[PDB]
Amino acid sequence: MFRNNYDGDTVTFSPTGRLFQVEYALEAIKQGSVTVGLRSNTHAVLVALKRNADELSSYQKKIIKCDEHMGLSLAGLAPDARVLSNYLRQQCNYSSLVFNRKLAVERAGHLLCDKAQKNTQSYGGRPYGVGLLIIGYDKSGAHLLEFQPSGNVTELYGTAIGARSQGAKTYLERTLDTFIKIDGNPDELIKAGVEAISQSLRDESLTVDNLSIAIVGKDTPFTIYDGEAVAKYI
Amino acid sequence: YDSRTTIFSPEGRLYQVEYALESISHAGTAIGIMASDGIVLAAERKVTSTLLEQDTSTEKLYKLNDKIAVAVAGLTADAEILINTARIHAQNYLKTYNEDIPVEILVRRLSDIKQGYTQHGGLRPFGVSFIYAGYDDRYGYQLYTSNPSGNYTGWKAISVGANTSAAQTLLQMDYKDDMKVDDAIELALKTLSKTTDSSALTYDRLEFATIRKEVYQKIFKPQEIKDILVKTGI
Amino acid sequence: MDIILGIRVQDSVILASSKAVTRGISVDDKTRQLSPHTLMSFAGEAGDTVQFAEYIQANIQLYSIREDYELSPQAVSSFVRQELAKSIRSRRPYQVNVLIGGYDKKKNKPELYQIDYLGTKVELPYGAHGYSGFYTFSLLDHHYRPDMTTEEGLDLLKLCVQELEKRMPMDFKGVIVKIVDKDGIRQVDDF
Amino acid sequence: MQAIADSFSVTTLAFRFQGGIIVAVDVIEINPFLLGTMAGGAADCQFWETWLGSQCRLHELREKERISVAAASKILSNLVYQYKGAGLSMGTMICGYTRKEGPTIYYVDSDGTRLKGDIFCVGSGQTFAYGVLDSNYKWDLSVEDALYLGKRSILAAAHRVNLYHVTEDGWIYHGNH
Amino acid sequence: AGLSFDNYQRNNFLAENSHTQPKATSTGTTIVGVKFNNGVVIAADAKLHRISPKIWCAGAGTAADTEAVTQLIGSNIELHSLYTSREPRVVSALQMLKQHLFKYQGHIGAYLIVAGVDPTGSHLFSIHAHGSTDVGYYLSLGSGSLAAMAVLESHWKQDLTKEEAIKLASDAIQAGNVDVCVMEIGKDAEYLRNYLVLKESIVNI
Amino acid sequence: GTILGIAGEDFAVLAVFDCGDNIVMSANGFAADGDALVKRFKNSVKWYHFDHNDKKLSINSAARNIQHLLYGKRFFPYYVHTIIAGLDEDGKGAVYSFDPVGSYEREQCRAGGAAASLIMPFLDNQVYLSVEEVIKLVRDSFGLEILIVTKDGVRKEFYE
Amino acid sequence: MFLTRSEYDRGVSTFSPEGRLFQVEYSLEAIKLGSTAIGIATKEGVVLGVEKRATSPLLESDSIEKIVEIDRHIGCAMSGLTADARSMIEHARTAAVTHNLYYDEDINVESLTQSVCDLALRFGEGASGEERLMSRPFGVALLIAGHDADDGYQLFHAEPSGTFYRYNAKAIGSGSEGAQAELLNEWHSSLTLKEAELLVLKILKQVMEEKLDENNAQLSCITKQDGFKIYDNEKTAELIKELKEKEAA
Amino acid sequence: NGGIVVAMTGKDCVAIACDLFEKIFHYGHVFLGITGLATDVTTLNEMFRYKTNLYKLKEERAIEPETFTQLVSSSLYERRFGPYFVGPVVAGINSKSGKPFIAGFDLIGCIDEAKDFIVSGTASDQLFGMCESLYEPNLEPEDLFETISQALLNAWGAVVYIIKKDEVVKRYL
Amino acid sequence: PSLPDTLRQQEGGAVPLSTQLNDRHPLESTLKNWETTQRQRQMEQYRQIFGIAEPMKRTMEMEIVNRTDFNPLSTNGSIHRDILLNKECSIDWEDVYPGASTMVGDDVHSKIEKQLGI
Amino acid sequence: YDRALSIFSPDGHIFQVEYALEAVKRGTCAVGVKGKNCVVLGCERRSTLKLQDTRITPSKVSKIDSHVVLSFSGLNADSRILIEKARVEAQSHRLTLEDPVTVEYLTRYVAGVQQRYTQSGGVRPFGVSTLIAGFDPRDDEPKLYQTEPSGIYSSWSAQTIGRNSKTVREFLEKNYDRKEPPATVEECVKLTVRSLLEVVQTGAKNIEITVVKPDSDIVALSSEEINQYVTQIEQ
């Protein structure tokens, strides 16, 4: 009721101090498909459930690589996912070329966060409606950043975002004491992620096509598995 | 659908421009008659009082150029700027082509200026309408009217402003093609006397000008208007 | 060589210009029809002059279409002068000379104007540019008379070109001739 | 707002005849129908080849129609005129055949001066080719007669080769003889 | 807008093509300004340009350039005085002239002496082309500057009265007609000029 | 300095930067201009992969791109001779060369620099070739770095 | 708990509860008003046809712009507000020719579709960080068909949402419901181009408003040799006659 | 081009003459003579016709000679870096006061507030000296015409405007 | 096309050609944008002295004034723009001489298209 | 969903452009008919008040170039400006390119101008639908196009716009044999006059006819009374 009078734009607080137009953007993630990321000191893994428009269509690209050392997975709005992914890839290229330096994941997270924030104050623009998981390995060690459209970037051992993400997140909370200790086995880490995502499925169980996995770590540059390559993990 | 000039109403008509057309209907009646040997402009001065300078106070008739003049009905403030631009354009044409601007080209330019104001949201429509009168070698004496809507038409004899309908009917009843200027003067005075809301139409209530005979045009000082009014028996 | 000649006579304006000279060519140029009763002959720097002439043609055709009425040769000449001055404001002057011949058809008189490279226009009974100037003037100053008919003007132009072809050490290429009358623009056959 | 703050935060021969146009070179394929021939440095020609081809392709796609030789020639003329005095080394011949204008040849000078013509020659040996062609060339000679005339003139210029032939269907074969 | 540059190329082409460009006028040889006990006196060999009723200026170099820039900045100072509702002071004129002549980088060939009296006191300055400036009790500009400056230095003394100031200024100009303006604190500025038929036709109006 | 390039049956040798996609190029002349061109070309290659789903380049596409890079300054050109070594779409070894104005040509072998006038005939007076004898031929022609490109990838080595 | 008007429908900048961005949702509703367009890819080619949807018999149906060429190897049909389709097609053609100029290779269909979608994405921030160019999303959805030496025959549906899907067979515009439902039943990997044409004609006949005729429907196909080529009225009439003979009885 | 223009004043009358394409123009009772490039004199004629027409329309009054002098000076200072190749000369009589007025300019706009006579253009010094030897103050209009015509003849074809306050006589020599 | 529109821009037409424009009075390149350069330098000075906020406010005010002041019939300059620049009581030649196409490119709609970037 | 151009209606319509089209229908009728080798443009001119200056006004069908003609319907003020932009484009094309404007190119440019003014909410779209007809240069195939405030354009054998479009278009649909269009110029003019008389209550004085012919030939008829007599007597 009264919310209807104050959620017209992201430039107006409600009498309770809430900023509804960005809470809606954060709720936009729930429309997207579930994606899962988990971390170990030697490798970091992403698992994403791809959605297809119809049985005659090819699946969406849930996972994007920005550099040989870092990649990301995203859920939410496609028009905003495109913008943020392109911006992060451009900044990785800028860091690698102009500074001869690999973009540190910690720096990249805040550099993307600063772009995300500006949209939540100026009129005309709207908050990005996409939450994406930056994943990479750098000099400081493995990394996994859950970026939210409110401009919040947080270091997580593992997380899940998208529709029905609560089951995967609860499984990750229940097995954090375990999946961190894998520390060297990529196959077992990807397997653990695969159980984690499997908790989030109501229908359309995992298949060689709808499932997609990525991994990066000490020895492995960011590599994406799909098709027959992921048949062993299902 | 009338708060901004850029909305077509469901009926498909611009309320903000029809309101402007209504505005000029409140201004003092301007009238122009075309004769075989010249044109005559008359206008009933709107704002008047014993203290106002009746001489050197040309409120209705303006000189755009030698062999061209305009009687303006509506907001004189807009009339001043439009007439300034008209003078500048006429002198630009003279400077470029070394020939006095044909009146139709001037009328077309001013009508396009007035229309452009009806089309951009940041500009309200001009609240004036002109009775152009001038002489040029292409068609000799000719007389045009132009509305806030930016359209114009050529008229043998037309009245603009307050109580336009009665004056137009009288002109239609009395006009003849083969008149002389010395008769168009009497016709214009008679029509204004029959159209005025005042009881007498004194010499100070009236403003007058004529283009005749290479072509002289005289904007009448109050003395000759006073003489002429009694000359025709008003 | 680039030479343009113009003679204003009782009923016509005879504009003539030498054919374009270029390696291995066969086929007019140095002339642009601005309207049914006025045409603009030009000479001078290659590229720049033709680019200016086409722009002037475009403007005059735009005016003709806009009003459905023909711009007078006096007005056309004034506009060409004004545009040439505008063009030369920003850049180095480029060698160009223009002869705007036309029949006004409102005063019913033939008028001819020459515009130099600096944008100065002079109404003329006759004119020339380039190597034609010195020799032709020596003849036109004696033979020209405004009462001569168009045929007499053509005879005088033929004499002028006959004189130039002797003065020019090169085997001269001849000149095209165009006439503008009350009946419109025309091109001659024997030149 | 914040955007404001962020800014402050920190020899060739060509002639036209009844059977089309013969192009003899000691050649540029703008289109299956448009046949250019560019003299000058290897850099300018190889770049403005692609640029003019792109322009003509855009025109063809937008208009769904054949681009006239006059239109392409004036496009190139305007382009090189904007660079007049900048140091372009061009001498260019744009030849093509289209029903709207038949066979036509346009030559573009380095300064942008565009000329129509029935015959054109360029190179060191242009004079001999022109002097042998002008003695026998005429509009109503046959396609085989045209090719023989091109052979004689160009082989004479070489003595003192690819022979393109462009028609309504476009340039038909390289004509390497 | 402003000074155009619309025919620089054409004028250069005319100059190389032997079309002699008409020469711009110059404002004479010498200028001298002398500060004295109760005000300042400015003299010139051309005119003494007025910036403000009690702020006057003498211009060396091109006559048009000085008559334009001094006139423009007098217009600026009149607007400023009206704006602040108080008398304008010579330091403002100096600053405005400095910035203006620096903006055009000396292409405006104006060499100026600015003298006046104001609520702060009497002032005397010199402005060269391209903005350089200096201050002093006595000054001289122009071709004949050296002899006039020598006369000033050999005769100038502290507390000399108006008559001596006028005498010294006129003598220095002579050593370089003569017009001098003398301004006193609290009194009107005193301008002292030159102190030392085949056929007939009728046309309409 | 001087640079030399050789094109073989299934390999190429350039006597330098590796830009990926089996593309190795070098520029000789004003060192600053050459280094700037190298950086810009690498940036262009990465942007190519970025916009075009990481599709591998071809020596011809890279050559055209570098032609556009060079010709973008036709009227104030970089004063550097540039050459490329790699494999073409047909699997043949391929070498392309460039000049300040942006020329465009393919060559089986070319040398660019002051010593080209001597190196070019020194090879020609005694020069199919397998991978090792192209190296020995370069050694006879000639510290100095050699980058050899083959279907299996790019290998970098250093010699005299 | 009182019924009140809801403002989230207006403006592309407004999220509603649950994060549904409607102005782009309503943009895809304008697609349904457009004429039906069908596309069917196969191992030996891709064929796409369109309902011409002539407003009146006086309109010259032979001069309607439903299918357009972008390059010798790429073509695309369109539906919806053709005013925006012209701008999208102009951008696509410019991008294709620019790529051919800069890289001396045919533009990959995926790259061209990405460029067109990036243009469609401009009602907000662009893919390359470009400032917004238009106040509203395109009311046009066009499917792009082409061939590349690596990907082969492929078909993409480019939406005004800034997203595309590689479709084996896709129908857009009016009657997308039944057309797509029948495509799911009909399409198979062994669908040769000869029967792909007849299948497209069958779909259009099943879903068109009036009797299928060569002057109210047209076809186009992509091939390595032929390239993008619209079928002549005689050719489409022959195909329609073959359909009538074969699918009847 | 470059014909010499000479202006001269008597009692309640001024006379302006030029060598002889007309080089003397009038914008009411104020006469402007322009010696220099043909293109620049034509351009100045057009420009000042434009400016004075606008002035008359806005003021309902013809521009007085001194106001016109200031106008031409300020219009010539524009293009300070591109100056016209012209030495103009203005002559006229104030409608209200009747005082004769003549002034000359440099190409940039410096005004020579002459009291007796003005010359400009090629051979400036010769005709200047001839006028100095020939001129006398407060001449009658016909004597003024004779003096100015004699000055021109000593330096054919020429046009001289003999200007009263209310009527102007234009004569060809 | 990529080529410039030689007609709608007027100014002599195709002549002058672009390459020929590269020969100017030395003071041309400076005064052509003097006001913008001086304001940029002043804004940088404020950014250094008064922090990022002061330039932000100063430029936001000017942008709001410029965006909402559209008057195609005149170029006299908005009254408030003078106050914001502290030009309310000063003159310069750019104000005294503000500085003509008759048939193309002069009408109001060209200015509307320019303003709205439409 | 009709207060701005930028808002889609829930059913996919942009109601503002539809209101602009409704504004088009407010203008007087204008009809065009393609002959086999000629094109006829007809216009219903308003019954002039007895004091209008007939000698100079009005003429509704205006030529954009030597070979192209642009009739219209809707706001006259907007039309006078769209026509001027079309003329400027025609001359600019004749300048930059050698060939005159293709009729299709000119109508596409006009449609772009109309579309461009629809792209932002700050401008009223041109409430006029032009009816461009003519022949391609050095060609003999008649061409006719219509443009709309939405920016849409289409080619028509015979089309009508403006007031009472339905009555005229219905008449044309049942009387124009597209399989064999009228051949003789006067036959096409008779068909056009018949189409207008179905809506124009007044005699020929209210009908304006202009015939465009190949090779840049245009003539505005002033003798339709003869054609009107034949149609009326036959009726």
GROMACS .gro file of N, CA and C in nm, chain I residues 11-83:
model
  219
 1634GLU      N    1   2.876   2.748  -4.539
 1634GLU     CA    2   3.012   2.795  -4.516
 1634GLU      C    3   3.101   2.766  -4.637
 1635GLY      N    4   3.060   2.816  -4.753
 1635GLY     CA    5   3.138   2.804  -4.874
 1635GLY      C    6   3.116   2.677  -4.952
 1636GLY      N    7   3.052   2.577  -4.893
 1636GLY     CA    8   3.026   2.451  -4.962
 1636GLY      C    9   3.139   2.351  -4.939
 1637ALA      N   10   3.163   2.266  -5.039
 1637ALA     CA   11   3.274   2.172  -5.029
 1637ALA      C   12   3.405   2.246  -5.010
 1638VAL      N   13   3.416   2.366  -5.065
 1638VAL     CA   14   3.529   2.455  -5.040
 1638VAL      C   15   3.494   2.539  -4.917
 1639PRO      N   16   3.583   2.549  -4.817
 1639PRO     CA   17   3.717   2.491  -4.809
 1639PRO      C   18   3.717   2.342  -4.777
 1640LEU      N   19   3.819   2.272  -4.824
 1640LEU     CA   20   3.839   2.132  -4.787
 1640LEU      C   21   3.910   2.124  -4.652
 1641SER      N   22   3.888   2.012  -4.582
 1641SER     CA   23   3.930   2.003  -4.443
 1641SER      C   24   4.080   2.021  -4.427
 1642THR      N   25   4.159   1.958  -4.515
 1642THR     CA   26   4.304   1.967  -4.502
 1642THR      C   27   4.354   2.111  -4.511
 1643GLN      N   28   4.284   2.196  -4.586
 1643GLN     CA   29   4.328   2.333  -4.605
 1643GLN      C   30   4.308   2.418  -4.480
 1644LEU      N   31   4.227   2.373  -4.384
 1644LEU     CA   32   4.201   2.453  -4.266
 1644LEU      C   33   4.319   2.456  -4.169
 1645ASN      N   34   4.421   2.373  -4.191
 1645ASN     CA   35   4.533   2.366  -4.098
 1645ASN      C   36   4.637   2.473  -4.127
 1646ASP      N   37   4.595   2.599  -4.127
 1646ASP     CA   38   4.686   2.712  -4.135
 1646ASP      C   39   4.614   2.832  -4.075
 1647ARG      N   40   4.653   2.870  -3.953
 1647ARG     CA   41   4.573   2.964  -3.875
 1647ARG      C   42   4.663   3.070  -3.814
 1648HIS      N   43   4.599   3.180  -3.775
 1648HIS     CA   44   4.667   3.280  -3.694
 1648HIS      C   45   4.711   3.215  -3.563
 1649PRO      N   46   4.833   3.243  -3.514
 1649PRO     CA   47   4.878   3.174  -3.392
 1649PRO      C   48   4.783   3.189  -3.275
 1650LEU      N   49   4.717   3.304  -3.263
 1650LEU     CA   50   4.625   3.329  -3.154
 1650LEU      C   51   4.489   3.264  -3.176
 1651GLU      N   52   4.464   3.210  -3.295
 1651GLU     CA   53   4.336   3.143  -3.322
 1651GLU      C   54   4.316   3.024  -3.230
 1652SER      N   55   4.415   2.935  -3.223
 1652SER     CA   56   4.399   2.811  -3.148
 1652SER      C   57   4.376   2.835  -3.000
 1653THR      N   58   4.414   2.952  -2.948
 1653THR     CA   59   4.398   2.980  -2.806
 1653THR      C   60   4.261   3.039  -2.776
 1654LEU      N   61   4.229   3.153  -2.838
 1654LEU     CA   62   4.106   3.224  -2.805
 1654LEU      C   63   3.981   3.149  -2.848
 1655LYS      N   64   3.993   3.053  -2.940
 1655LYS     CA   65   3.875   2.979  -2.984
 1655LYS      C   66   3.806   2.910  -2.868
 1656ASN      N   67   3.881   2.876  -2.762
 1656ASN     CA   68   3.825   2.808  -2.646
 1656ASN      C   69   3.882   2.866  -2.516
 1657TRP      N   70   3.909   2.997  -2.514
 1657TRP     CA   71   3.974   3.057  -2.398
 1657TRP      C   72   3.888   3.045  -2.273
 1658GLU      N   73   3.758   3.075  -2.286
 1658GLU     CA   74   3.672   3.076  -2.168
 1658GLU      C   75   3.664   2.937  -2.106
 1659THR      N   76   3.648   2.834  -2.189
 1659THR     CA   77   3.642   2.698  -2.137
 1659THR      C   78   3.773   2.659  -2.070
 1660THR      N   79   3.886   2.696  -2.130
 1660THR     CA   80   4.015   2.663  -2.070
 1660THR      C   81   4.032   2.731  -1.935
 1661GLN      N   82   3.996   2.859  -1.926
 1661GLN     CA   83   4.009   2.930  -1.799
 1661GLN      C   84   3.917   2.872  -1.693
 1662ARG      N   85   3.793   2.838  -1.730
 1662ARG     CA   86   3.704   2.777  -1.632
 1662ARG      C   87   3.755   2.641  -1.588
 1663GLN      N   88   3.810   2.562  -1.680
 1663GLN     CA   89   3.866   2.433  -1.642
 1663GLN      C   90   3.982   2.450  -1.545
 1664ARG      N   91   4.070   2.547  -1.572
 1664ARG     CA   92   4.182   2.571  -1.482
 1664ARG      C   93   4.133   2.616  -1.344
 1665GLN      N   94   4.033   2.704  -1.341
 1665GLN     CA   95   3.979   2.749  -1.213
 1665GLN      C   96   3.914   2.634  -1.137
 1666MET      N   97   3.841   2.547  -1.207
 1666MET     CA   98   3.779   2.433  -1.142
 1666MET      C   99   3.884   2.338  -1.087
 1667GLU      N  100   3.993   2.318  -1.160
 1667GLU     CA  101   4.102   2.237  -1.107
 1667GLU      C  102   4.161   2.301  -0.982
 1668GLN      N  103   4.178   2.433  -0.983
 1668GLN     CA  104   4.231   2.503  -0.866
 1668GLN      C  105   4.140   2.482  -0.745
 1669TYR      N  106   4.009   2.496  -0.765
 1669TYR     CA  107   3.915   2.473  -0.655
 1669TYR      C  108   3.918   2.328  -0.610
 1670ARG      N  109   3.924   2.234  -0.704
 1670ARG     CA  110   3.935   2.093  -0.668
 1670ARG      C  111   4.055   2.069  -0.578
 1671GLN      N  112   4.167   2.133  -0.607
 1671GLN     CA  113   4.287   2.118  -0.525
 1671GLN      C  114   4.273   2.186  -0.390
 1672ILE      N  115   4.210   2.304  -0.386
 1672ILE     CA  116   4.207   2.382  -0.263
 1672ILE      C  117   4.085   2.346  -0.178
 1673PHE      N  118   3.966   2.351  -0.237
 1673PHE     CA  119   3.841   2.334  -0.164
 1673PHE      C  120   3.785   2.193  -0.171
 1674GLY      N  121   3.859   2.098  -0.227
 1674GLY     CA  122   3.813   1.961  -0.236
 1674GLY      C  123   3.727   1.936  -0.358
 1675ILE      N  124   3.693   1.809  -0.378
 1675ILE     CA  125   3.617   1.768  -0.496
 1675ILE      C  126   3.476   1.825  -0.493
 1676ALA      N  127   3.423   1.853  -0.374
 1676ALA     CA  128   3.283   1.895  -0.365
 1676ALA      C  129   3.258   2.029  -0.433
 1677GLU      N  130   3.349   2.125  -0.418
 1677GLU     CA  131   3.326   2.259  -0.470
 1677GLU      C  132   3.319   2.259  -0.623
 1678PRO      N  133   3.415   2.197  -0.693
 1678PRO     CA  134   3.399   2.185  -0.839
 1678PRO      C  135   3.272   2.114  -0.879
 1679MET      N  136   3.233   2.010  -0.805
 1679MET     CA  137   3.111   1.938  -0.837
 1679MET      C  138   2.990   2.030  -0.832
 1680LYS      N  139   2.976   2.106  -0.723
 1680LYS     CA  140   2.864   2.199  -0.711
 1680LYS      C  141   2.870   2.306  -0.820
 1681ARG      N  142   2.989   2.362  -0.843
 1681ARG     CA  143   3.002   2.471  -0.940
 1681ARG      C  144   2.963   2.424  -1.080
 1682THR      N  145   3.007   2.305  -1.119
 1682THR     CA  146   2.976   2.254  -1.252
 1682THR      C  147   2.832   2.207  -1.261
 1683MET      N  148   2.776   2.153  -1.153
 1683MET     CA  149   2.636   2.112  -1.156
 1683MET      C  150   2.545   2.231  -1.176
 1684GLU      N  151   2.573   2.343  -1.108
 1684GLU     CA  152   2.492   2.462  -1.129
 1684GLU      C  153   2.495   2.505  -1.275
 1685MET      N  154   2.614   2.512  -1.334
 1685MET     CA  155   2.626   2.557  -1.472
 1685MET      C  156   2.557   2.461  -1.568
 1686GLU      N  157   2.569   2.330  -1.543
 1686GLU     CA  158   2.504   2.234  -1.631
 1686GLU      C  159   2.352   2.245  -1.621
 1687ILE      N  160   2.299   2.264  -1.501
 1687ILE     CA  161   2.155   2.282  -1.487
 1687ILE      C  162   2.110   2.408  -1.560
 1688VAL      N  163   2.188   2.516  -1.549
 1688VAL     CA  164   2.151   2.639  -1.619
 1688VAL      C  165   2.153   2.618  -1.770
 1689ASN      N  166   2.258   2.554  -1.821
 1689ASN     CA  167   2.270   2.536  -1.965
 1689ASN      C  168   2.161   2.446  -2.020
 1690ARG      N  169   2.131   2.336  -1.950
 1690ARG     CA  170   2.037   2.238  -2.003
 1690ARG      C  171   1.896   2.295  -2.015
 1691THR      N  172   1.854   2.377  -1.920
 1691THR     CA  173   1.716   2.425  -1.915
 1691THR      C  174   1.696   2.559  -1.984
 1692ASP      N  175   1.801   2.621  -2.037
 1692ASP     CA  176   1.791   2.750  -2.105
 1692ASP      C  177   1.802   2.726  -2.255
 1693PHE      N  178   1.688   2.714  -2.322
 1693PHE     CA  179   1.681   2.699  -2.466
 1693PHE      C  180   1.602   2.816  -2.523
 1694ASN      N  181   1.667   2.896  -2.608
 1694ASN     CA  182   1.603   3.012  -2.671
 1694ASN      C  183   1.658   3.024  -2.812
 1695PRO      N  184   1.599   2.952  -2.908
 1695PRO     CA  185   1.661   2.944  -3.041
 1695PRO      C  186   1.670   3.076  -3.114
 1696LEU      N  187   1.588   3.175  -3.078
 1696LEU     CA  188   1.586   3.301  -3.152
 1696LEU      C  189   1.698   3.396  -3.113
 1697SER      N  190   1.776   3.365  -3.009
 1697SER     CA  191   1.880   3.455  -2.964
 1697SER      C  192   1.999   3.376  -2.912
 1698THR      N  193   2.116   3.440  -2.916
 1698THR     CA  194   2.238   3.386  -2.858
 1698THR      C  195   2.297   3.484  -2.757
 1699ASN      N  196   2.214   3.571  -2.699
 1699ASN     CA  197   2.264   3.676  -2.610
 1699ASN      C  198   2.324   3.620  -2.482
 1700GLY      N  199   2.296   3.494  -2.449
 1700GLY     CA  200   2.347   3.436  -2.326
 1700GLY      C  201   2.253   3.454  -2.209
 1701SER      N  202   2.231   3.347  -2.133
 1701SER     CA  203   2.138   3.352  -2.021
 1701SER      C  204   2.187   3.451  -1.916
 1702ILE      N  205   2.093   3.519  -1.851
 1702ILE     CA  206   2.128   3.617  -1.749
 1702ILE      C  207   2.196   3.549  -1.631
 1703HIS      N  208   2.145   3.434  -1.589
 1703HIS     CA  209   2.201   3.366  -1.473
 1703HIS      C  210   2.338   3.306  -1.502
 1704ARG      N  211   2.362   3.265  -1.627
 1704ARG     CA  212   2.493   3.215  -1.664
 1704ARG      C  213   2.601   3.319  -1.638
 1705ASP      N  214   2.568   3.447  -1.657
 1705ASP     CA  215   2.663   3.553  -1.627
 1705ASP      C  216   2.691   3.560  -1.477
 1706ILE      N  217   2.587   3.549  -1.395
 1706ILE     CA  218   2.607   3.558  -1.250
 1706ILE      C  219   2.692   3.442  -1.201
   0.00000   0.00000   0.00000
